[PDB]
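Q: For a teaching session next week I want to show students how multiple molecules come together into a single three-dimensional assembly. I've collected the sequence lines for a complex. Could you give me the predicted structure tokens for the whole thing so I can convert them for display?
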Amino acid sequence: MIVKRGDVYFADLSPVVGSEQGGVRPVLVIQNDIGNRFSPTVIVAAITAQIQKAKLPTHVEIDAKKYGFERDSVILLEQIRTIDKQRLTDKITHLDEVMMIRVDEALQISLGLIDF
Amino acid sequence: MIVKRGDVYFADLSPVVGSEQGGVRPVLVIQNDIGNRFSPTVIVAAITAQIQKAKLPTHVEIDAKKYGFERDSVILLEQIRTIDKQRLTDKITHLDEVMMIRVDEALQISLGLIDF
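A: Of course. Below is the structure for the complete assembly, covering every listed component.
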């Protein structure tokens, strides 16, 4: 497995503390692709299948049966982790460039790189 | 403690897996300030005092005795974590806007938002 930005893998984010997102779940690779080749770690954003009753600009909705997913899921760009590549177990899919453009904007909002 | 982007706190990032950065160490808050007020989690980058013999564009050098630090340290924008605010124990300092402009660029390189 060569890891690419935009790939979705399963990974176990547990153990966590407090409101950190834990569990085995899809994660989205958001680290640059040079890092993805030379580093033993990747940076991921958590994906959840739980319906969000608060909308936030750090959330990117994946609507079921176009990017992999069996039901509506949400990429949580406020829930980002550097994890060792050994945590990634199965690839799932890869998000296309229109989705990742949405990810890029939620990511910049999350990290204060553009206005909220 | 109201948490602000640019603040440096101590936090325990352990337990970790593989090459994920662990231990009690300074971390830099990089989450936007709206998130910093309404969320129970913040996004941080790890800071290390270990001399880096590889230079990387995801690294931002803090030169001793101008931003807080007792010796030369490096902000690792490839080592970023969403952590519960309960992990933050003591504030240390706050990086000024010239430092954070450097952080912003290393962060965008790390996350593939600009060219490597």
